[PDB]
Write an enzyme that holds these catalytic residues in place. Structure first.
Site, PDB file in Angstrom:
ATOM      1  N   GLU A   1     123.886  14.694  29.375  1.00  0.00           N
ATOM      2  CA  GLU A   1     124.044  13.830  30.547  1.00  0.00           C
ATOM      3  C   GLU A   1     123.397  12.455  30.401  1.00  0.00           C
ATOM      4  O   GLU A   1     123.709  11.540  31.170  1.00  0.00           O
ATOM      5  CB  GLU A   1     123.512  14.567  31.787  1.00  0.00           C
ATOM      6  CG  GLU A   1     124.303  15.851  32.072  1.00  0.00           C
ATOM      7  CD  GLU A   1     123.652  16.776  33.084  1.00  0.00           C
ATOM      8  OE1 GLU A   1     122.405  16.879  33.117  1.00  0.00           O
ATOM      9  OE2 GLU A   1     124.386  17.433  33.855  1.00  0.00           O
TER      10      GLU A   1
ATOM     11  N   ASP B   1     133.313  22.371  35.905  1.00  0.00           N
ATOM     12  CA  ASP B   1     133.891  23.709  36.101  1.00  0.00           C
ATOM     13  C   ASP B   1     134.100  23.929  37.604  1.00  0.00           C
ATOM     14  O   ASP B   1     133.772  23.053  38.415  1.00  0.00           O
ATOM     15  CB  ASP B   1     132.968  24.785  35.515  1.00  0.00           C
ATOM     16  CG  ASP B   1     131.581  24.750  36.117  1.00  0.00           C
ATOM     17  OD1 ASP B   1     130.717  24.002  35.606  1.00  0.00           O
ATOM     18  OD2 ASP B   1     131.353  25.469  37.110  1.00  0.00           O
TER      19      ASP B   1
HETATM   20  N1  LIG Z   1     128.706  26.384  37.960  1.00  0.00           N
HETATM   21  C1  LIG Z   1     127.522  25.730  37.936  1.00  0.00           C
HETATM   22  N2  LIG Z   1     126.419  26.280  38.522  1.00  0.00           N
HETATM   23  C2  LIG Z   1     125.230  25.642  38.521  1.00  0.00           C
HETATM   24  N3  LIG Z   1     125.082  24.452  37.941  1.00  0.00           N
HETATM   25  C3  LIG Z   1     126.165  23.880  37.347  1.00  0.00           C
HETATM   26  C4  LIG Z   1     126.282  22.605  36.635  1.00  0.00           C
HETATM   27  C5  LIG Z   1     125.264  21.532  36.375  1.00  0.00           C
HETATM   28  N4  LIG Z   1     124.156  21.843  35.470  1.00  0.00           N
HETATM   29  C6  LIG Z   1     124.437  22.572  34.208  1.00  0.00           C
HETATM   30  C7  LIG Z   1     123.124  23.280  33.885  1.00  0.00           C
HETATM   31  C8  LIG Z   1     123.221  24.811  33.910  1.00  0.00           C
HETATM   32  S1  LIG Z   1     124.259  25.414  32.623  1.00  0.00           S
HETATM   33  C9  LIG Z   1     123.467  25.397  31.121  1.00  0.00           C
HETATM   34  C10 LIG Z   1     124.110  25.864  29.975  1.00  0.00           C
HETATM   35  N5  LIG Z   1     123.490  25.854  28.783  1.00  0.00           N
HETATM   36  C11 LIG Z   1     122.239  25.387  28.689  1.00  0.00           C
HETATM   37  C12 LIG Z   1     121.589  24.911  29.827  1.00  0.00           C
HETATM   38  N6  LIG Z   1     122.209  24.928  31.021  1.00  0.00           N
HETATM   39  C13 LIG Z   1     122.153  22.792  34.941  1.00  0.00           C
HETATM   40  O1  LIG Z   1     121.521  21.540  34.623  1.00  0.00           O
HETATM   41  C14 LIG Z   1     123.052  22.552  36.128  1.00  0.00           C
HETATM   42  C15 LIG Z   1     127.612  22.548  36.255  1.00  0.00           C
HETATM   43  N7  LIG Z   1     128.261  23.669  36.671  1.00  0.00           N
HETATM   44  C16 LIG Z   1     127.414  24.487  37.318  1.00  0.00           C
END
Ligand SMILES: Nc1ncnc2c(CN3C[C@H](CSc4cnccn4)[C@@H](O)C3)c[nH]c12
Ligand SMILES: Nc1ncnc2c(CN3C[C@H](CSc4cnccn4)[C@@H](O)C3)c[nH]c12
Lengths: 229, 229
Positions: free
Chosen positions: B13, B197
């Protein structure tokens, strides 16, 4: 002497210290009040953060960065998981996890995120100092693991599941977050909790009944540690 | 000019901004790296906090208190709840709640703790500036509510429940905590998310596929806002 932060979550966990100290000044900062007092050769900074991980993280950060805390002692109450713990009993955390930090969908263990570990450790010198104070005052003091999260646990199934996963002796909503901030900012951290309930059915009722008294037991103890520091 | 904090959770990011800026210096602090660069008349401080509420709270606190940030722009990705949002679409938060902050056993609403509110608001001037930039660049930009918590949401039932309770348009793990810190420290806050997503079954797979690209869309946008500031 040194600058010592004393932090709790709720007014009930800190007001007993303010009533003992009597002479203190106030500063409004970070949508909260921070309290300042002399005690022996030390300069104390005290506050209750408000409940939970975010609030406690912010207060710990402020007390170290803005108000120069060189040590941080956390005092408050907790829900007992270990069956040998009774209401009123003191527990200091050797290490702490966040049970509700969950990216397990990507294969990681519960409580783990990249760059960090599952457990955050407290300071060994402060923990040993607490053991000495406990011996001197003839107070029973247990060492253990604390599981932290942003839920009040009052459910036998949840209690059992968190206990099993982390080998946790108690739960609360601020410990792991405070200990993480302190570790990150290179400040020795001590986390002390007196049991207010057993985190099962009716834990909310036991909390209401015992919070005021258990909070005083913890608060008295951390002030006794400030004497030995 | 002014000191502007640009904050994300993950390297993905923020690294697109570092690659655009080219000339920057580093400071190791709070068990993390903070990046510093000139941009127009402004002085930028950038970082990825690591995932979750505690990590993001600490970074926001540090960037304001230690590194003097006068404004904070958050950039990153999120899981879409609103059915009109598609992968890659930009959403700025008008307000945010912590869906997993729970003392409901004592009768309080989900997300509420004493001393605080259910929703934290972002800064109206920054939000209006974002609307101007979106018009200039012919970019579709939606305003909405973001629900924050320390779980990766990849479950239709959980998605639906959080959407219903908070009228949330998306979910993520840092927004509410960052916006709270900024409000507490009297710093204007902007929270921007590009969808990676739809937070349902297979959300982890969509995230892996689209995170890099969605992160760039958000990152480009906040840098365009720094031009107009
Ligand atoms: N469906 C969702 N639910 C909760 N959060 C999110 C996000 C945003 N971010 C991604 C990340 C978790 S995944 C992650 C994966 N690999 C390593 C670290 N974090 C966290 O910073 C929140 C995008 N989609 C989301
Ligand atoms: N079983 C348990 N689970 C999680 N935490 C605890 C605690 C310790 N504290 C109490 C308080 C939430 S209860 C609260 C009650 N009334 C008003 C506000 N907060 C929070 O600061 C954590 C004691 N027992 C716990």
């Amino acid at each position: 002497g040194m600058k010592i932060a004393i932090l709790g979550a709720m007014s009930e966990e800190i007001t007993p210290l303010l009533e003992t100290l009597k002479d203190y000044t106030k500063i409004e900062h970070a949508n909260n009040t921070y309290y300042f007092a002399k005690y022996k050769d030390h300069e104390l900074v005290l506050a209750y953060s408000k409940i939970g991980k975010v609030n406690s993280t912010l207060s710990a950060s402020v007390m170290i960065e803005k108000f120069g805390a060189q040590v941080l002692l956390f005092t408050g109450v907790a829900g007992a998981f270990n069956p040998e713990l009774e209401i009123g009993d003191l527990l200091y955390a050797t290490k702490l996890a966040q049970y509700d930090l969950d990216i397990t969908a990507f294969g990681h263990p519960l409580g783990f995120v990249p760059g960090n570990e599952i457990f955050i450790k407290t300071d060994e010198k402060l923990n040993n100092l607490a053991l000495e104070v406990a011996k001197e005052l003839n107070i029973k003091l247990r060492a253990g693991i604390i599981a932290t999260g942003d839920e009040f646990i009052c459910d036998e199934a949840k209690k059992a599941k968190i206990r099993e996963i982390f080998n946790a002796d108690a739960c609360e909503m601020e410990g792991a977050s405070v200990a993480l901030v302190c570790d990150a900012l290179k400040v020795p951290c001590f986390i002390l909790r007196a049991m207010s309930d057993k985190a099962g059915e009716k834990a909310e009722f036991d909390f209401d009944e015992f919070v005021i008294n258990s909070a005083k037991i913890s608060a008295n103890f951390v002030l006794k540690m400030c004497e030995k520091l």
